[model samples]
Target: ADLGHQTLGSNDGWGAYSTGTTGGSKASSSNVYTVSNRNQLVSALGKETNTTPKIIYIKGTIDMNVDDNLKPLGLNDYKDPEYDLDKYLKAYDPSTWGKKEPSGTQEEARARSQKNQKARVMVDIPANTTIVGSGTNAKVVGGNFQIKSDNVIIRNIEFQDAYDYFPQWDPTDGSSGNWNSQYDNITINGGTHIWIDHCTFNDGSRPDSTSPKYYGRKYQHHDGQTDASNGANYITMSYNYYHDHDKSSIFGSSDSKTSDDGKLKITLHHNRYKNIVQAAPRVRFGQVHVYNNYYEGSTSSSSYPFSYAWGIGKSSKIYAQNNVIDVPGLSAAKTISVFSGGTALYDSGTLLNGTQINASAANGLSSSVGWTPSLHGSIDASANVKSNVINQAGAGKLN
Candidate 1:
């Protein structure tokens, strides 16, 4: 060893990347579990269920497509005859839930039915686990990585082609209605103390813009990259690239703040968003601190030309600082798009081009919030964010 000195890992900044608090799967070389395929990876994760941690190291690309033995049934085969949108919408319409949306039996049935479908590829992640990819080329495709336990670390991987072949149609999503898909690249549903670093997310060869239609409108088979919802707290998303996708990331579950008010606290910093359409994160009721991120967009691409950058809705308190926005068509005013539920946002030292950001406080959010965020480290200026993030962020071979 260099200098015969040993050092424990540390959470340099933001959420829970610390040595002891978010410590995951601490193990020696003898105990480390290495996997090179999907079946081996699944078996390794299923072995430990309790607080005793395990380090699962992944090498090469784990293709999640089903093999020949399971021809009649596979994760990629969309042969479920009951996968009809009209029947699903009629059975569990969101409008019918009304006030009973939380504990409604219909909503529960809808979730259960979705779980039964093959398109909902779910992978269980256990607590006190560190799943590290070996190189920049290690990848996962055609499935959702679910994290429901605490103290999990994911690093140095690439996630791609997580597409749902069949998407359900909801006539009430927008004015002309929309098609909704299930599953994300990573879903941190009810976990705590998580860290995601040095990764990449994309929608594979079949992006939504180029894919065929289901009904009349365009069918979107992809969902968010990393979604933190349902009390997934004390998280950090850093040094990642989320590109060639739509609905990039969402923080909270819904606009109903009673259940999620004090819960979903998260920090996002030093990430790169490239050629993404919208929701570079649309946040809800969390003390979300976003700073020093580099967002680059396109106005020429007819399919995806960069919609709203940061959406602060519900009772969420977002403190945005020193982020570099380079979308030519999208201005500073349109960047901070506020939805209903009376959001609160505060910004300082952000730059759109080379100039300081000009944000309108009249979007309906007030100046100050009730609480202050003491979790994250200090942020750098926007002038230096582009060079620092482009040179450092995304799928790198980290130590």
Candidate 2:
């Protein structure tokens, strides 16, 4: 609300309850909302839990840096500045800050302090809500869609981590890899109606860390994940664009032990995944319906060298269908590389049906063109009056 400085007119109007008129920006305030950070924004939604599931129309680009004058709340560069929260807020002034600081240089101490507090974001979520992002350009940072409440819908918003804005953390620690670190993006603990449609979760960086400290990400840590320990059910993640997520990103695990058995019933349909660092989407328990998605550039020699484009858990019921994996270069069979780590759950023969994704089979010389996926698409099946969940896309078809 900082840029446009306007509230939603009313739910009856187009984007009525949002800042935009007729679901469009007024072009008066540079079309941006330069809010403080994730924690602060949650405070803004304070006591509004009973509020109807209307839209909180956010404008402008999202910048990881609070002082980023160029992006100016634009969605193009919002990367959940959680990694920089403590330092930026000066929370570790050796006074008001409660936690003890670890040993390191000032910068290292700052990074460590920031990493520790990132987990707190998951503890708070305004219940009974829906977060809708603008299509394609609708970008959000920090909390992608890991809603702890119910009746939340994140629609048509683009989830972005601009190249220069990607986080830099030690992947070995597996701490600061995601938006809220352990907090799952689009988590529905016990939601009845949840929809994540026509949005995107993209890593705006290439394989190499291009951005320096001043401009972009200097390293790639944890990128994306789909952990539904809070008991996610009846949710849909479809027609979204996912690209550039580093390896070990996008996973589903009951690590929290929230569920008696930790089950999630989410549908992933008609999404486009491109150029993942190692693996694209890793699924676990519950029923994950992946249908009609377009996956490209997942198993590129430079991108996904270690594993396949996507995977599901050994015990989970994953319905992967109508997905088209297009890699015009690689010659090896664009197959699903299973690395269960010898775990009982993911041992083998666990996949249900239609989970076969088509990557380019490696032929001797085909690797010469450097086959990689560039374009992708998907169909969303949410009850919000979009397309039905019955995907019918070629290659990536689902029942």
Candidate 3:
């Protein structure tokens, strides 16, 4: 059983083999909680600074935008009187406003509004906590899980639509002005000994296609489905589904975060990525093991077309084995993208569009990874990876 006191299964990847990810093993029955709503969820986990061992079960669809009395909340519920959406658009309209970054009164007001929303939806998993779905339909909407502690396990939950109402329009970010927003389904910053399994992340009814564009760009409202950034270590994300999203999963935040030089040991196995545009994960400064995963095309839209599957960035040591990448339109050479002096890659038995495409070699990246993964899950036969992953990954697939 993957409840409290349960460590990852043998060879389940880095989470078990590198260090036993024993979350809330010492929890008392009193600390074991069943929460079905946002207020109850918050109280069950307690403060972010608390390290008490806890086992919290999310039973049903918990909406993060809710008050203590179970009343649903809206963006207007958390607004400061000074922050008005119409005023913000009027003040920063690029038609009249210069290409310079947003500033002055409106920007400050927007920041305050974002902070207010963050206070409710940003759920932090304290050290040694195990949070799992109680049954097949357990889900959370409009939520963000921030893990900045140690020894945590999250399993079998559907995380949907972590929308940020206060998306900032930045004119200088991209060739065309980009909309930058906060609120990730999950983020691990300086976390250690973590295992996230059988979880599903996606935008629900209101997907990116339904989003309105601003300043000639789709106003972005979400970030990574999950990211392990800033020196986080010993994480294994296995059997998860990233469905219909963009910028899904990242290992590091910056090229200049030199403290990540030797940290961020991550393992991703048996995960399914569908309709995702990019970052089906982008890595930096980590020894990352990716095996037995599945990928498909970006049916999300042509505007957000399919891009690279694996992003090798500065100082990354990547070893991808027995993964099935079946994005039909993506060429083998375009599978892995490099950035910021990334040179290490060792691909073994990975299929690119049903063929043995050694993408790293095709890309002329010959720098051998400094390390090898001895702690990964059993490498499925290359031909069997796609079927196994589709059958075994995602929420309600965990038994």
Candidate 4:
């Protein structure tokens, strides 16, 4: 087999195979998982696919209200399923379907075939494949982002808040399931060279079910979406804007359930968080890198947000030289330099320069709002986190 060399994180499958048609409910060779745009994603990945990116561009604003980009095919009233996809499929290319003389006269056939077709494109990302999302318009909603296959790069896509939950109709228990569901902006199961850059996470505000008009208040928990699928390796989440996240801003949702083994080699850097009330990025046992990100916005009266606090089962971690917030004492010389729990949490690692790291007077850093390299922490000082950063003009963008 190609010089008898073996490789890890390799995808070995037949290439140039199509799933025949692009229908959502169509079943694949395996009956367990229905083949749709996602399977096209899987098939486009593999050793034979040559690792060139197969681009699937989403072409409209998908509704946060329903599944598959506001596409309810089987719903009784929509009648979209009745509308022939063949019509729109040809509209993109009129010469072919037009030459055939569409059934009925031009006006009659146009009316019959008129369709408000909702589409979500799926492209398989092979090893060394790069997928770019259209800055504001591009979105991945009502779908799953799986990376079990390997080696992918994704950026600029707005990961939508596509959770389907209701308190009154859907009771909490083993039957309806807890409000916690496991879906991420992007899930990298097990792979290498996975970089998520410049993307935005849109966690749409969960409706206040407990308002005086509603009775489901007691049933709803704050930031209820936790315990999601464990993501993959060498994953870099950087230069992104995350807003309105309920349970937490950015985190590793690894708990031995979603990921059977665990998460490894994660890096969260240079991202911005705003309007985030609680749960700022929790990391479990892994080689973690948290650096150079701005955390802004305030919590509602009902919420208390911690900038960052290491969770249980975290091992082999690294937090070096990142700007959480500017300290007054260290910068302005109030009392002792450096903030609590900010640098006290982990075993102190080397600085950007290969030197012993600590926030002593010997390090000599002026008290600007930026972070100093020589500090390490295990302190708890949530009260010191500043909320004014979000109110500044152009506050939410990266510095």
Each model's TM-score?
0.85, 0.55, 0.95, 0.49
The per-candidate count of clashes, in order, stands at 1, 46, 0, 13
Q: After superposing candidate 2, which stretches have Cα over 4 Å from the reference?
A: 1-44, 47-52, 64-112, 115-125, 134-136, 141-145, 162-192, 205-208, 211-219, 225-227, 247-251, 254-262, 301-306, 328-334, 339-399
- Model 4, position 207, has a per-residue lDDT of 30
lDDT per residue, candidate 4, 1-399, as tens digits? 110011111111101011111111122333212113333334434343444333333333433223344344322232333344344333422334333323433324333322221122222244544444433455555333545544455555666653422212122334322232334445554544455556666554443233222112233322322221344554555566666555443344444433422344555555556555444355444445555545544322243332322232323233433435331122212111232222223323222122233432233332231222221122212232222223321212321
lDDT per residue for candidate 3 within 30-121, as digits (tens), equals: 88988999988898888877687889888989999777787887878877779888888889888889788999888998899899889888
Q: State in Å the error of residue 372, model 3.
A: 0.3
In angstroms, give how far residue 296 of model 4 lies from its true place: 1.6
Tens digits of per-residue lDDT, candidate 2, 1-399, equal 421122222321111211222211222333222233443344434553534333344333443323323333322333333335335334333334333432235435444544443433233335444344332244455443445555444455555542223232322233322122233344445543455555556544433344323111233333453334445555555556565665433334543443523346555655655565444456555555555555555344554433455553434444444455555553334334433321211111111122332231221111122111111233332221112222322111210
Q: Which structure is stronger by TM-score: 3 or 4?
A: 3
TM-score of 2: 0.55
In what order do the candidates fall by lDDT, top score first?
A: 3, 1, 2, 4
Scored by Cα lDDT, where does model 2 land? 0.40
Candidate 1: segments with Cα more than 4 A from true spot: 1-14, 17-25, 28-31, 47-50, 67-76, 81-120, 360-364, 397-399
* Candidate 4 displacement at residue 21 in angstroms: 31
Better model by lDDT: candidate 1 vs candidate 3: 3
lDDT of each: 0.71, 0.40, 0.85, 0.37
